[PDB]
Design a protein around this motif. Structure first.
Motif, PDB file in Angstrom:
ATOM      1  N   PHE A 169      39.634  44.325  46.893  1.00 45.58           N
ATOM      2  CA  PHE A 169      39.627  43.684  45.290  1.00 45.58           C
ATOM      3  C   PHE A 169      40.018  42.080  45.515  1.00 45.58           C
ATOM      4  O   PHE A 169      41.072  41.922  46.484  1.00 45.58           O
ATOM      5  CB  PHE A 169      40.820  44.430  44.742  1.00 45.58           C
ATOM      6  CG  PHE A 169      40.477  45.640  44.281  1.00 45.58           C
ATOM      7  CD1 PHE A 169      40.838  46.790  45.240  1.00 45.58           C
ATOM      8  CD2 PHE A 169      39.740  46.026  43.219  1.00 45.58           C
ATOM      9  CE1 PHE A 169      40.711  48.150  44.879  1.00 45.58           C
ATOM     10  CE2 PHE A 169      39.527  47.441  42.868  1.00 45.58           C
ATOM     11  CZ  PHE A 169      39.848  48.451  43.624  1.00 45.58           C
ATOM     12  N   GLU A 170      39.805  41.260  44.767  1.00 46.73           N
ATOM     13  CA  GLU A 170      39.777  39.877  44.975  1.00 46.73           C
ATOM     14  C   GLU A 170      41.402  39.505  45.019  1.00 46.73           C
ATOM     15  O   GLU A 170      41.828  39.015  45.981  1.00 46.73           O
ATOM     16  CB  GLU A 170      39.038  39.186  43.891  1.00 46.73           C
ATOM     17  CG  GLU A 170      37.503  39.065  44.211  1.00 46.73           C
ATOM     18  CD  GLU A 170      37.188  37.798  45.069  1.00 46.73           C
ATOM     19  OE1 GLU A 170      36.107  37.169  44.804  1.00 46.73           O
ATOM     20  OE2 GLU A 170      37.864  37.308  46.046  1.00 46.73           O
ATOM     21  N   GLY A 171      42.058  39.319  43.784  1.00 43.94           N
ATOM     22  CA  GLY A 171      43.166  38.907  43.549  1.00 43.94           C
ATOM     23  C   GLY A 171      44.570  39.508  44.051  1.00 43.94           C
ATOM     24  O   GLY A 171      45.498  39.908  43.397  1.00 43.94           O
ATOM     25  N   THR A 172      44.441  40.063  45.171  1.00 44.21           N
ATOM     26  CA  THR A 172      45.284  40.779  45.860  1.00 44.21           C
ATOM     27  C   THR A 172      45.067  40.932  47.481  1.00 44.21           C
ATOM     28  O   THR A 172      43.880  41.089  47.824  1.00 44.21           O
ATOM     29  CB  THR A 172      45.760  42.386  45.150  1.00 44.21           C
ATOM     30  OG1 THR A 172      46.710  42.896  45.822  1.00 44.21           O
ATOM     31  CG2 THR A 172      44.586  43.145  45.546  1.00 44.21           C
ATOM     32  N   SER A 173      46.149  41.326  48.331  1.00 40.03           N
ATOM     33  CA  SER A 173      46.008  41.854  49.580  1.00 40.03           C
ATOM     34  C   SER A 173      46.057  43.268  49.339  1.00 40.03           C
ATOM     35  O   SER A 173      46.077  43.790  48.338  1.00 40.03           O
ATOM     36  CB  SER A 173      47.252  41.155  50.649  1.00 40.03           C
ATOM     37  OG  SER A 173      48.490  41.667  49.874  1.00 40.03           O
ATOM     38  N   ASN A 226      35.574  44.515  41.485  1.00 40.57           N
ATOM     39  CA  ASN A 226      35.479  43.520  40.981  1.00 40.57           C
ATOM     40  C   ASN A 226      36.686  42.750  40.302  1.00 40.57           C
ATOM     41  O   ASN A 226      37.079  42.833  39.299  1.00 40.57           O
ATOM     42  CB  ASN A 226      34.603  43.436  39.464  1.00 40.57           C
ATOM     43  CG  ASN A 226      34.182  42.266  38.879  1.00 40.57           C
ATOM     44  OD1 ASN A 226      34.384  41.214  39.635  1.00 40.57           O
ATOM     45  ND2 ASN A 226      33.651  42.115  37.743  1.00 40.57           N
ATOM     46  N   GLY A 227      37.611  42.202  41.112  1.00 40.91           N
ATOM     47  CA  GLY A 227      38.823  41.577  40.990  1.00 40.91           C
ATOM     48  C   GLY A 227      39.673  42.757  40.459  1.00 40.91           C
ATOM     49  O   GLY A 227      39.650  43.860  40.559  1.00 40.91           O
ATOM     50  N   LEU A 228      40.880  42.146  39.738  1.00 42.19           N
ATOM     51  CA  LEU A 228      42.125  42.998  39.323  1.00 42.19           C
ATOM     52  C   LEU A 228      41.900  43.743  37.920  1.00 42.19           C
ATOM     53  O   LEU A 228      42.600  43.772  36.991  1.00 42.19           O
ATOM     54  CB  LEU A 228      43.204  42.750  39.282  1.00 42.19           C
ATOM     55  CG  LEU A 228      43.535  42.109  40.872  1.00 42.19           C
ATOM     56  CD1 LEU A 228      45.129  41.159  40.425  1.00 42.19           C
ATOM     57  CD2 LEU A 228      43.455  42.797  42.002  1.00 42.19           C
ATOM     58  N   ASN A 229      40.334  43.978  37.575  1.00 42.67           N
ATOM     59  CA  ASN A 229      40.082  44.583  36.104  1.00 42.67           C
ATOM     60  C   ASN A 229      40.494  45.881  35.853  1.00 42.67           C
ATOM     61  O   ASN A 229      41.391  46.273  36.370  1.00 42.67           O
ATOM     62  CB  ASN A 229      38.652  44.251  36.042  1.00 42.67           C
ATOM     63  CG  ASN A 229      37.599  44.900  36.848  1.00 42.67           C
ATOM     64  OD1 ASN A 229      38.048  45.898  37.633  1.00 42.67           O
ATOM     65  ND2 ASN A 229      36.402  44.577  36.945  1.00 42.67           N
ATOM     66  N   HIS A 230      39.589  46.472  34.824  1.00 44.68           N
ATOM     67  CA  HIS A 230      40.036  47.804  34.465  1.00 44.68           C
ATOM     68  C   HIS A 230      39.768  48.967  35.628  1.00 44.68           C
ATOM     69  O   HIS A 230      40.326  49.969  35.764  1.00 44.68           O
ATOM     70  CB  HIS A 230      39.125  48.091  33.451  1.00 44.68           C
ATOM     71  CG  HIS A 230      37.562  48.199  33.571  1.00 44.68           C
ATOM     72  ND1 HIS A 230      36.878  47.193  33.488  1.00 44.68           N
ATOM     73  CD2 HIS A 230      36.794  49.221  34.005  1.00 44.68           C
ATOM     74  CE1 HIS A 230      35.734  47.274  33.797  1.00 44.68           C
ATOM     75  NE2 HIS A 230      35.480  48.647  34.255  1.00 44.68           N
ATOM     76  N   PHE A 231      38.861  48.403  36.674  1.00 45.84           N
ATOM     77  CA  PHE A 231      38.383  49.417  37.804  1.00 45.84           C
ATOM     78  C   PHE A 231      39.851  49.644  38.627  1.00 45.84           C
ATOM     79  O   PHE A 231      40.198  50.705  39.173  1.00 45.84           O
ATOM     80  CB  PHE A 231      37.287  49.098  38.399  1.00 45.84           C
ATOM     81  CG  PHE A 231      37.200  49.963  39.857  1.00 45.84           C
ATOM     82  CD1 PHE A 231      37.124  49.147  40.667  1.00 45.84           C
ATOM     83  CD2 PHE A 231      36.785  51.221  39.565  1.00 45.84           C
ATOM     84  CE1 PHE A 231      36.842  49.842  42.250  1.00 45.84           C
ATOM     85  CE2 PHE A 231      36.663  51.923  41.000  1.00 45.84           C
ATOM     86  CZ  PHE A 231      36.566  51.381  42.045  1.00 45.84           C
ATOM     87  N   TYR A 232      40.320  48.386  38.941  1.00 46.64           N
ATOM     88  CA  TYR A 232      41.541  48.260  40.043  1.00 46.64           C
ATOM     89  C   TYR A 232      42.517  49.313  39.397  1.00 46.64           C
ATOM     90  O   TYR A 232      43.239  50.180  40.202  1.00 46.64           O
ATOM     91  CB  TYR A 232      42.185  46.724  40.080  1.00 46.64           C
ATOM     92  CG  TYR A 232      43.320  46.891  40.814  1.00 46.64           C
ATOM     93  CD1 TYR A 232      43.136  46.634  42.050  1.00 46.64           C
ATOM     94  CD2 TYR A 232      44.664  46.846  40.271  1.00 46.64           C
ATOM     95  CE1 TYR A 232      44.226  46.649  42.937  1.00 46.64           C
ATOM     96  CE2 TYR A 232      45.744  46.644  41.024  1.00 46.64           C
ATOM     97  CZ  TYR A 232      45.548  46.916  42.534  1.00 46.64           C
ATOM     98  OH  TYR A 232      46.686  46.326  43.280  1.00 46.64           O
ATOM     99  N   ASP A 233      42.805  49.502  38.074  1.00 44.91           N
ATOM    100  CA  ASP A 233      43.600  50.384  37.451  1.00 44.91           C
ATOM    101  C   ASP A 233      43.282  51.686  37.466  1.00 44.91           C
ATOM    102  O   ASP A 233      44.118  52.566  37.853  1.00 44.91           O
ATOM    103  CB  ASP A 233      43.796  50.085  35.980  1.00 44.91           C
ATOM    104  CG  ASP A 233      44.471  48.878  35.754  1.00 44.91           C
ATOM    105  OD1 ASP A 233      44.359  47.838  36.514  1.00 44.91           O
ATOM    106  OD2 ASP A 233      45.127  48.841  34.681  1.00 44.91           O
TER     107      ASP A 233
END
Ligand code: NA
Length: 553
Positions: free
Chosen positions: A347-351, A280-287
């Motif tokens: 992830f949405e906000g990234t390649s 779900n985008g660059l949220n806490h999960f991306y981390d």
């Protein structure tokens, strides 16, 4: 023009045509590009390789413990429910039974493939037919303490998550499981499926049931499963032996719930934790995923997308097409934006790229004319300057290239001063060629990737050519021993080095390989039709960079 998915010049899916073929056992096989496995051309042939197995109805024969359930004896039944047994019933252990129970206990895949069932309307109680991705997940969730899955949507993940949760509580005593989700009804649905698994187990694998409701179950061994809406309250208030976090990426205000989780796992009463979600985008999960994937948080990353459902790899005409038209049809009737959101776990906000495009845009190069060999000289050797060399040997030769980087390590900012890049130089004459560049750059020490070709090259340099500057992690291994972790943290360190501007890259083709060196979950690689040899050779340097001996070769 493009297959919808291949929107830009980049190929995200190969046509069935280009796939490797094989004729075996009277049928035509075609290799899949997603997992590299062999699949029959005819869909009908796939079905007779994955056919349904009926678990027979057994109330009659207690001797046949594998299927036996005392369904007709109501006193033995929990609350008169045929599928469930009353708490604290003594099982009559034969020698066979103990072995089989123990077998299931420490072989989850066997337990899942033999005893987990679904009750079909046409065939009765049948075995659940596990999928390769599910099987992979069971192994990981089992063998590892902390695991995180970045899955796509409409993968029947719950089926596997249920089986695992069932296996945990059925073969562990006095262990509390808490399922956490955005809504409590979501986590209620998860344990419902776990209950659907538990209720189909034979008597000898089914522990007696103490409590059995919508939000909670409890077994006569002491183990429990609780359905909770994710909150900092739920974590602190309960002593969990296992925490499963459903749809993690879609839990708002998770930071406090996550901080509550830390002491429960991190040094630490030491309990298991399994996270599964679509991104779900660059949220806490991306981390979370990034830390796992870069090998920093002790979590074991796993990923699976649409192509893991192998039914999708056969078209309307029931011929294998490696998901070519299913994907087309699913793109149509919806949107590309939605397909990525539903089926690709991107992830949405990234390649995908290891190095952010934000950095790849600022990176300038120095154009140079190379040697007779593949050597690009960016800055000449200087007396009293320290250099470091990394070598990723081919295998290979187109297939792929030999990649040697020479890095000026003298100052606080490290600089790429020379690159050998060749798919023409044999690995028999390479050691000498490489050596004259190493010797040109003040007896430059070299860290060689120990692949089939590398090991050989390492021998020639260190022994035949008697070069005293070849870096080794051991005496058996004269270079960098390839491991999952070395690559992982090598990439992680390379990312840092490049982005914080500690390492300066001058080679255009190196920067260009970084441009297509992207997510290949759970790692990074070159996308279709690109090379990663120059990048991978720098990953070697990245990993070397973390080593204590490097803090001043
Ligand atoms: Na060394």
């Amino acid at each position: 023009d493009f297959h919808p998915l291949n929107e830009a010049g980049k190929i995200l899916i190969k046509h069935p045509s280009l796939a490797e073929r094989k004729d075996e056992d009277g049928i035509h096989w075609i290799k899949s590009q997603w997992d590299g496995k062999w699949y029959p051309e005819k869909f009908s042939d796939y079905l007779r390789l994955h056919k349904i197995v009926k678990i027979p109805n057994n109330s009659d024969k207690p001797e046949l413990f594998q299927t036996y359930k005392d369904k007709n004896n109501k006193r033995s039944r929990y609350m008169g429910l045929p599928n469930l047994k009353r708490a604290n019933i003594k099982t009559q252990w034969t020698r066979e039974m103990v072995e089989e129970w123990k077998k299931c206990r420490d072989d989850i895949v066997y337990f899942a493939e033999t005893y987990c069932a679904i009750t079909h309307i046409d065939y009765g109680v049948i075995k659940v037919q596990l999928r390769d991705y599910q099987r992979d997940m069971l192994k990981i969730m089992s063998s590892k303490r902390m695991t995180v899955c970045n899955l796509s949507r409409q993968l029947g993940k719950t089926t596997v998550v249920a089986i695992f949760l069932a296996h945990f509580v059925c073969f562990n005593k006095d262990k509390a499981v808490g399922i956490l989700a955005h809504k409590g009804s979501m986590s209620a649905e998860v344990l419902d499926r776990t209950k659907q698994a538990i209720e189909l187990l034979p008597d000898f694998l089914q522990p007696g049931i103490v409590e059995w409701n919508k939000g909670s179950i409890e077994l006569d061994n002491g183990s429990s499963i609780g359905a909770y809406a994710s909150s900092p309250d739920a974590v602190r208030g309960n002593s969990f032996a296992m925490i499963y976090i459903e749809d993690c990426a879609f839990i708002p205000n998770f930071h406090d719930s996550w901080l509550a989780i830390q002491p429960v796992i991190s040094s630490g009463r030491r309990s298991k934790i399994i996270i599964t979600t679509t991104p779900n985008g660059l949220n806490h999960f991306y981390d979370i995923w990034t830390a796992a994937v870069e090998g920093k948080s002790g979590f074991e990353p796993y990923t699976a997308i649409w192509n893991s459902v192998k039914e999708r790899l056969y078209n309307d005409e029931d011929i294998f097409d490696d998901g070519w038209q299913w994907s087309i049809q699913t793109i149509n009737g919806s949107s590309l934006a939605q397909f990525r959101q539903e089926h690709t776990a991107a992830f949405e906000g990234t390649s995908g790229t290891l190095i952010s495009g934000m950095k790849l845009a600022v990176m300038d190069f120095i154009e140079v004319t190379p040697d007779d060999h593949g050597f690009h000289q960016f800055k000449k050797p200087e007396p009293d300057r320290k250099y470091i060399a990394t070598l990723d040997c081919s295998e290979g030769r187109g297939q792929d290239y030999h990649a040697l980087h020479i890095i000026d390590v003298t100052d606080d900012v490290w600089e790429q001063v020379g690159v050998l890049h060749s798919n023409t130089i044999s690995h028999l004459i390479l050691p000498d060629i490489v050596m004259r560049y190493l010797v040109e750059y003040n007896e430059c020490p070299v860290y060689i990737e120990l692949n089939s070709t590398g090991v050989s090259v390492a021998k020639s340099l260190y022994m035949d050519l008697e070069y005293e500057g070849v870096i080794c992690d051991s005496y058996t291994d004269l270079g960098m021993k390839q491991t999952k972790r070395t690559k992982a943290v090598g990439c992680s360190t390379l990312k840092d080095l490049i982005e914080k501007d500690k390492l300066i890259i001058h080679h255009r083709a190196t920067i260009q390989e970084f441009r297509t060196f992207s997510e290949k979950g759970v790692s990074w690689a070159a996308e279709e039709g690109y090379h990663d040899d120059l990048v991978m050779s720098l990953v070697i340097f990245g990993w070397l960079s973390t080593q204590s001996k490097f803090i001043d070769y």
